[PDB]
Amino acid sequence: TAVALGSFPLSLRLGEPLTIVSEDGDWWTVLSEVSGREYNIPSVHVAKVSHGWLYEGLSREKAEELLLLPGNPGGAFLIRESQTRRGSYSLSVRLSRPASWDRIRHYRIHCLDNGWLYISPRLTFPSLQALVDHYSELADDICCLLKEPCVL
Numbered sequence: 001t002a003v004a005l006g007s008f009p010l011s012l013r014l015g016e017p018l019t020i021v022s023e024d025g026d027w028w029t030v031l032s033e034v035s036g037r038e039y040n041i042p043s044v045h046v047a048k049v050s051h052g053w054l055y056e057g058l059s060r061e062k063a064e065e066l067l068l069l070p071g072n073p074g075g076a077f078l079i080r081e082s083q084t085r086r087g088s089y090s091l092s093v094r095l096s097r098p099a100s101w102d103r104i105r106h107y108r109i110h111c112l113d114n115g116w117l118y119i120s121p122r123l124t125f126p127s128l129q130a131l132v133d134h135y136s137e138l139a140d141d142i143c144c145l146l147k148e149p150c151v152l
Helices: 060-067 128-135
Strands: 002-004 017-024 027-032 038-042 046-050 054-056 077-081 089-094 104-111
Touching (some): 002 027, 060 104
Antiparallel strands (some): 017 027, 027 038, 077 089, 089 104
């Protein structure tokens, strides 16, 4: 349901799966699902996850960090809500055999004022689930077929 984003403060690290115990303002209480240890951490150091690939509070930079962890093949992907906008998202997908200076490709997921979502205006979707479904099988309009969700 949640993931640690950085070193804190024997310690948590990026990608570590979490269980949220309390959300008291900008400080959350979490449990690591590998060590069981309890942590009192700033909310900004944690990302919420739903649908196995939908992240909240995950920056563009931290998304690259997550996707670039070992064990993520080419096509590994996630969707992250914009930290600037509302129901606006970005698709981040690991590139296959990339050069070191461009290993991750980000696509804006446009949401019209009508609530439908798309990367290419020719192909619109009623939900992120429908979008991921589609691009897991057909992805000619983008760089990469969506293979697997980012590890954890």
